[PDB]
Design an enzyme around this catalytic site. Structure first.
Site, mmCIF file in Angstrom:
data_model
loop_
_atom_site.group_PDB
_atom_site.id
_atom_site.type_symbol
_atom_site.label_atom_id
_atom_site.label_comp_id
_atom_site.label_asym_id
_atom_site.label_seq_id
_atom_site.Cartn_x
_atom_site.Cartn_y
_atom_site.Cartn_z
ATOM 1 N N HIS A 72 34.220 51.629 44.672
ATOM 2 C CA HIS A 72 34.378 52.248 43.353
ATOM 3 C C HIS A 72 34.297 51.247 42.214
ATOM 4 C CE1 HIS A 72 38.746 51.386 43.911
ATOM 5 N NE2 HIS A 72 38.705 51.212 42.605
ATOM 6 N N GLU A 114 39.284 31.212 38.416
ATOM 7 C CA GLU A 114 40.026 31.650 37.239
ATOM 8 C C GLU A 114 41.530 31.612 37.461
ATOM 9 O OE1 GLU A 114 39.178 32.243 34.358
ATOM 10 O OE2 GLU A 114 37.337 33.507 34.160
ATOM 11 N N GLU A 130 36.276 27.025 36.060
ATOM 12 C CA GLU A 130 35.600 28.277 36.303
ATOM 13 C C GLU A 130 34.166 28.086 36.752
ATOM 14 O OE1 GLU A 130 36.921 27.589 33.239
ATOM 15 O OE2 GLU A 130 38.391 29.133 32.759
ATOM 16 N N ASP A 190 35.747 52.659 51.255
ATOM 17 C CA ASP A 190 35.785 52.073 49.916
ATOM 18 C C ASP A 190 35.661 50.565 50.001
ATOM 19 O OD1 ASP A 190 35.923 51.821 47.162
ATOM 20 O OD2 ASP A 190 38.076 52.280 47.040
ATOM 21 N N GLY A 204 43.084 47.672 37.363
ATOM 22 C CA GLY A 204 42.568 46.330 37.214
ATOM 23 C C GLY A 204 42.696 45.469 38.443
ATOM 24 N N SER A 228 41.924 46.750 41.580
ATOM 25 C CA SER A 228 40.988 47.263 42.565
ATOM 26 C C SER A 228 39.995 46.205 43.005
ATOM 27 C CB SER A 228 40.156 48.431 42.045
ATOM 28 O OG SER A 228 40.808 49.655 42.209
ATOM 29 N N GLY A 229 39.655 46.265 44.290
ATOM 30 C CA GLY A 229 38.665 45.360 44.841
ATOM 31 C C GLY A 229 39.237 44.051 45.310
HETATM 32 CA CA LIG Z 1 39.728 31.004 32.503
#
Ligand SMILES: [Ca+2]
Lengths: 223, 57
Positions: free
Chosen positions: A40, A52, A62, A84, A175, A177-178
């Site tokens: 999704h 990050e 990064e 999913d 936020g 998810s995944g």
């Molecule tokens: Ca950063």
């Protein structure tokens, strides 16, 4: 993540952010060219952000790498949420270092009661909206399939498991998810869905990665 | 019932995807957080799409 804690910078080196001009989902790095996330979370034009901590500031570790393929499971059902899972290929290989590292896939499924680490940049409030700058972490146990089905009658497939605390207060939220659910060093889950965030009797639901290991390995090798 | 008049629906999935909904109380398409699955119809990928479908509801 509701009810969690600040992980500490780059302490979860396999956690990535999926960016479409803003953070919208997490993911887990499984080799230098491939990320696992939720089906999704599919969007065209994804940029994967590795290394990050503060997602709102450039801090020095990064790597920002475009997706070259975003492959949703061929049996993903967008109504039942079964299957999913999505694999994202990076357009160039990430440089692996202490702050950007892969997580192992499972060799067997985890049992009820196994404590896991769930992480992400999702909402930290159970009623209202607060999105963190830095990565948040939560320790939570896998729950039995019977308890998960009792919480969500008719909704839990063999490719889902519940994790969390039935009293409320600790959960994944919008936020996250995944992103990863890691248990004894293995990626056992992907943040998928729930009913609100951190509500009593409504634990989070996670894609059961151990059912997909053969598919992950063969799909990666075929692309 | 007019789907443009329904409150925005985040749904059960745990993404933080910015979408648009028509807010009839303000007379404006506005942003909201969609969780990534089980969208209702007052849920658009752009302000232009929302205005075209729902403006003036
Ligand atoms: Ca950063």
């Amino acid at each position: 993540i509701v009810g969690g804690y600040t992980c500490g910078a780059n302490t979860v080196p396999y956690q990535v952010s999926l960016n479409s001009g803003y953070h919208f989902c997490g993911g887990s790095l499984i080799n230098s060219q491939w990320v696992v996330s939720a089906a999704h979370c599919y969007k065209s034009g994804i940029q994967v952000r590795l290394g990050e901590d503060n997602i709102n500031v450039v801090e020095g570790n990064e790597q920002f790498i475009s997706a070259s393929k975003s492959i949703v499971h061929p049996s993903y059902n967008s109504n039942t949420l079964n299957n999913d899972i999505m694999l994202i290929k990076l357009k160039s290989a990430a440089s692996l270092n202490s702050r950007v590292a892969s997580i192992s896939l499972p060799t067997s499924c985890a049992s009820a009661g196994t404590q896991c680490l769930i992480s992400g940049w999702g909402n930290t409030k159970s009623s209202g909206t607060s999105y963190p700058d830095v990565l948040k972490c939560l320790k939570a146990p896998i729950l039995s399939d019977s308890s998960c089905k009792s919480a969500y009658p008719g909704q839990i497939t063999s490719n889902m498991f519940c994790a969390g605390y039935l009293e409320g207060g600790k959960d994944s939220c919008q936020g996250d998810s995944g992103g990863p659910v890691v248990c004894s060093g293995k990626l056992q889950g992907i943040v998928s869905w729930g009913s609100g965030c951190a509500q009593k009797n409504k634990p989070g639901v996670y894609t059961k990665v151990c059912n997909y290991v053969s598919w992950i390995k063969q799909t990666i090798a075929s692309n | 019932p007019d789907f443009c008049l329904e409150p925005p629906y985040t749904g059960p999935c745990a993404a933080r995807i910015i979408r648009y909904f028509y807010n009839a109380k303000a007379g404006l398409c506005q942003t909201f957080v969609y969780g990534g699955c089980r969208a209702k119809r007052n849920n658009f990928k752009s302000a232009e799409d929302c205005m075209r479908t729902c403006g003036g509801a």
